[PDB]
Amino acid sequence: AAEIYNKDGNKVDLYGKAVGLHYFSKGNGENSYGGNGDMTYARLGFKGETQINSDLTGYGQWEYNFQGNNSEGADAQTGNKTRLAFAGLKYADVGSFDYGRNYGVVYDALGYTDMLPEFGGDTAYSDDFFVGRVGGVATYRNSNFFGLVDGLNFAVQYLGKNERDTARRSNGDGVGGSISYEYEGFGIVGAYGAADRTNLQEAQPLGNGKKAEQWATGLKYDANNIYLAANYGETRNATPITNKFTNTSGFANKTQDVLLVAQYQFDFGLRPSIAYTKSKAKDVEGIGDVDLVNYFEVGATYYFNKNMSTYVDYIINQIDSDNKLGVGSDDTVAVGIVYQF
Amino acid sequence: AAEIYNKDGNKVDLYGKAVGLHYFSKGNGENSYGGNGDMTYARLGFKGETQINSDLTGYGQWEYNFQGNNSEGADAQTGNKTRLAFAGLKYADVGSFDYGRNYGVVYDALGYTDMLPEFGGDTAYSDDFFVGRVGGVATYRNSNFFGLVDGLNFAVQYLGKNERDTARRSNGDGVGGSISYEYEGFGIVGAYGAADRTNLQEAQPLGNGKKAEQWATGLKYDANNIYLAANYGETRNATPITNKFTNTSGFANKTQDVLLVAQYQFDFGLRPSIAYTKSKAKDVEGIGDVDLVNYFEVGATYYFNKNMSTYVDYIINQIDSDNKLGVGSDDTVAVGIVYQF
Amino acid sequence: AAEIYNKDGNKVDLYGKAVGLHYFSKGNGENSYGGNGDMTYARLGFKGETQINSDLTGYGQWEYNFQGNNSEGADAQTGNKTRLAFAGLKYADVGSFDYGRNYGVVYDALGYTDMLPEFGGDTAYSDDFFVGRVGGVATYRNSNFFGLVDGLNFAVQYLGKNERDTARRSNGDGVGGSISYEYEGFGIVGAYGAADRTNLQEAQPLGNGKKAEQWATGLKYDANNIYLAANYGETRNATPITNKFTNTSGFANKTQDVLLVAQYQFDFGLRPSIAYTKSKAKDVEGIGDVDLVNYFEVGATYYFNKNMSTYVDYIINQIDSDNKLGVGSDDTVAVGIVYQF
Numbered sequence A, B, C: 001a002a003e004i005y006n007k008d009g010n011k012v013d014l015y016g017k018a019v020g021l022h023y024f025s026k027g028n029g030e031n032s033y034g035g036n037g038d039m040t041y042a043r044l045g046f047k048g049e050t051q052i053n054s055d056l057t058g059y060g061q062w063e064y065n066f067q068g069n070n071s072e073g074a075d076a077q078t079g080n081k082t083r084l085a086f087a088g089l090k091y092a093d094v095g096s097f098d099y100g101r102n103y104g105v106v107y108d109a110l111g112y113t114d115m116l117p118e119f120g121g122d123t124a125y126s127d128d129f130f131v132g133r134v135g136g137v138a139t140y141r142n143s144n145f146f147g148l149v150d151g152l153n154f155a156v157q158y159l160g161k162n163e164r165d166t167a168r169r170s171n172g173d174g175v176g177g178s179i180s181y182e183y184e185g186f187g188i189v190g191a192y193g194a195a196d197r198t199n200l201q202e203a204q205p206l207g208n209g210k211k212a213e214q215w216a217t218g219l220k221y222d223a224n225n226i227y228l229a230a231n232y233g234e235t236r237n238a239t240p241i242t243n244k245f246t247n248t249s250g251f252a253n254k255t256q257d258v259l260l261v262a263q264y265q266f267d268f269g270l271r272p273s274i275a276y277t278k279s280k281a282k283d284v285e286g287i288g289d290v291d292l293v294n295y296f297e298v299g300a301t302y303y304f305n306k307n308m309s310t311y312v313d314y315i316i317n318q319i320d321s322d323n324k325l326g327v328g329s330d331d332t333v334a335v336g337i338v339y340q341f
Ligand SMILES: CCCCCCCCOCCOCCOCCO
Pocket: A179, A180, A181, A188, A189, A190, A217, A218, A219, A230, A231, A232
C-alpha cells in the first residue's frame, strides 16, 4: 500500500488495485466453472496501526470490492461489498484481539492453497461460518506462543450469530480455533470451528442438523522461489449447495475437501501454477455423494514488478455433464491485467 | 485525518475509521432501544481546503458510511450511504457559504449533547428538515460577528425541497438560522427553522399541517476535562413516527425534547459518561401524549490515544412495555473498539 | 490529484471532488431538459503508474460517482456507480494497451465538445457501445505514430459483449478505431465503431437491425485562452430512445448529431461558454424524424484556482412542446460550486 501517514507512532496505508479481467468459457458460460465475459473489478482499502506504547499497538482495516463489470444503470451495485472491517489491539507476548468483519479462523488453514492466479480457494466461502470472511467475529491470536516458542501460533475465535434473511448468509453463535507451526520454509496448520445453525438454515430441504462444523489441516512450503501447499478439510451442515434440477437449496450434510497447489517463481517474473481442487459432498438428500468442485488448474502470473502483473488461469473442469446437482462441467480460462498499489 | 496533500495553499485530508461494534439486548432485540447483534461499520471521507488569497478560502468535504455488518450477498449495501457532500467559500470577516448535503442548522444546537460513546443524539434525525444531515441545504455562517464580537456566531440556512418517494425522507422549501455565544468554556445556542411539507407528507395519517417547525436551545461547558451539555427542543409536524399497532406512519404533531449529558476525561484515558434523553410526542392522532425516547445512559470510552479507543455504552431504557406506539422498552448495551485516522 | 506515493518508479494519485449543484427548471422539472432540484454529487478515484523499465510503464485507474442528493434511507444508492476501472501497459513507440471499463473509442471524437460547465456531451451515452464509458473494452493506442509523426495518434478497440438484463445497457461484440492529428493548437479526429446487437436489443419495438454503428468527426482549437470545438456524428441502431406516449423503448434506427462549443478563458478566472447541440433521430418507427436533443447553451465557470470554482449553465431548450417522443421542452439552469483535488 501507499503510506499516507507516519507520525507519532500512527501509520496508515491506503491500498487498492484495478484488475482488468475477462473469462472465456463455452457458449454463454452457463454450464462452466467460472462463467463467461468481462469480470473486471477494483479494490480499495485502508490499513492503520498506532503504536500506543512500547508493548501495545492498536490497528484497524477496511477493504471494499467495486465491480467494474456493471453498467452505470440499475445494476450498478451488483457484487459490490465491504470485504473487511475490524479493529483490534495487540499486546506484546500476550496476544492480539480484534472484532468486526474478518476471516474465519478455519481460513487460517484454507489460506494455504488460496494462491492461484485467479481461481482456487473454492471452499473458503464468504459468510459461511469459519472458512471465509464473515461478520461479527471476535478473534484472539497469539504469535510464537507468548514469545516462548518461535514459529508456534494459535488462535481462538468467537463467531456471533448473524440472523440474515437468507439461510446461505446466516449463522448462529460458534467458537473455533487454530494452531500452526512454521519451520525452515514449511508451515503446518490445523483449524476447527463449530456453531449453531439458525432456524431458517434448519428449515432448508438440503442439510440436516443443529450444529455446523468445519475443520481443515494444511501444509505449505514457501521458500527458494517455490510455493507448494496442500489442504484437507471436512464440513458438516456447513457448505452451501443448490440442486438446480429441483430448484432446492441448503447445505451439504457433509463434504470432504482436497486442495493442492504448486508454483515456481522465475527471477524474470514468470510464476507458473498447477493445482487440483476437489470438494465432495456426501449424504446429500436424494443423492448421496456428489462432487461440488473438481478441476485441475494450469496457469501463470507474469510479474513486471510489485505493482503490475498479468495472468492467465486455465481451469480443466472434471465435473461431468450429468452432475446430480447441476454443477457446471465446462472449462473456464481467465485472463487478467493488474495494477496495484 | 491524514494530510495527503499540502502545496500551493491547498491541503487535503483523507480520514476514516473502522469500528468493531456489538449490541447486546434481551432476546432478538426486537423490543429494545438499539437492537441486538453485530453493528460494525467503517467511515471514509476527504476534507479539503484551498487558500485562494489572503482573505478567501475554498473548501469541500465528502463522507461515507460503509456498514461492516452485512453479508457479501444481496444485502451487501444495507445502511451504506453518503453522509456529507458539500463545497463552499469563506471570506474573512464576511462569512462562509456552502451548499450540498450537510448538517441542518438546528443541529447547531442539537450537536451540543450528541456526544455519547455510541448512542444519544436521538432527535437529530437524518433527512428530517433541520435537525440532522439533509440534502440540498445552502448555509451561510458568520464567526465572531464580522470580526466585531469574539465568541458570537450566527448562521442562516435555506433548505431546498426534496420530493422523495417516502414522506419520511422528504421536505419542502424552508429557512432557518441559529445564533451561538461562547465564553470562558461555556457555549449557549438557539436555532430555529421552518419549512413547507410535501403533499406526500401531508397525506400520511399521523401529523397534520402545512408547515414543519423545529427549534432547540443548548448550553454546554467544555473545559477543565469536563463536558456537560443540555438541550431543549420542540418540533411541529417534523419528527417522524410510526404506530406499530396500526401499522401507520407519519410525523408527530408536536414533540418536546430534553437531552442532558455529563462527562469527565481522566488523564489516563478513561472518559465516563452519563446522560438523559427524553423525547415526548404530543397531540398524536388517537393517542395524545406518547414518549418516543426515554432513557438514562451510563457509559465510558477508554482512549489509548487519538487513534485508538474502546467503549461500552449502557442504555437504561425507561420506555414502558405498553408504550402506545410500540416503542421498544428493553435496555441495550453497546461495546465498541475503534481505530480512526 | 494528490500524489500519495512516489517511490521506486511507482506514482499514485488519489483524486476527487465535491460538487454542490442545483438545477432550476419550470415546475417539477418533469418537462425540462435537465430536471429540477438538488443534484449535488462527489467523485473519488485513484490513478497509478509504475515505471517498469526505461521503455515500459504499467498503469491503472478507478473512478467512482457518489450522489450527494439521496437520503440516507432506502434510496441511498441511487445513481452511485463505478465510472472507470482498467489497467494497462505502455511500451515506448509501440503503443499502449488497457482493458476494463473505459471510454469507448468514438469518445476520442465526442470528447472534443464535452466541455460545458455542467451540461453538453449529450450523445456520449454511458454503456452505449463506443460513445461513452462502457464495460469490457480492450483498447490499443498509439501516440505520434510509433514516434515517427508528431501529433498523429490512432486507436483500435475491441468491445466485448455485455449481455445485461436491459437492452439499454447491453451490447454485442464489436470493434472500432480512431485517428487524430494535432497541430499548432488545433486537433482533428475521426472515429468509427461497429458491433453486434444482442437478442434483447433486437426484440425492442424501436430500432431494427443486427449491427449497431457509431462514428463522429471533430475539430477543436485549444490555445490562446480560447476553446472552440465542433463534432458531427451519425449512429445506426445505437442511440437509446423512449416514446413516452406509447411507453415503448429501444434504439433510434439512425441519428445525425451536431455539437458546437466556444469558450474563452479570462486571466482573472471567468470562462464564459456558448454551445449548440442537436441530436436528430431519423426513421424512428411510427414517426420518422424526431429531435432527441436541441438547445443552445450560455454559461460560465469562474475559476478561483485549480481547486475551487463555481459555475452557472443555462440551457435554452429548443425542443418543442409537441415533440413526438415526449422529450422535455423546458429550459434548465444549473448552478454549481466545486472543490476538487
Ligand atoms: C503443532 C502444530 C499443530 C498442527 C495441527 C495439524 C497437524 C496435521 O498436519 C497438517 C498437514 O496437512 C495434512 C493434510 O491432510 C489431512 C489429513 O488429516
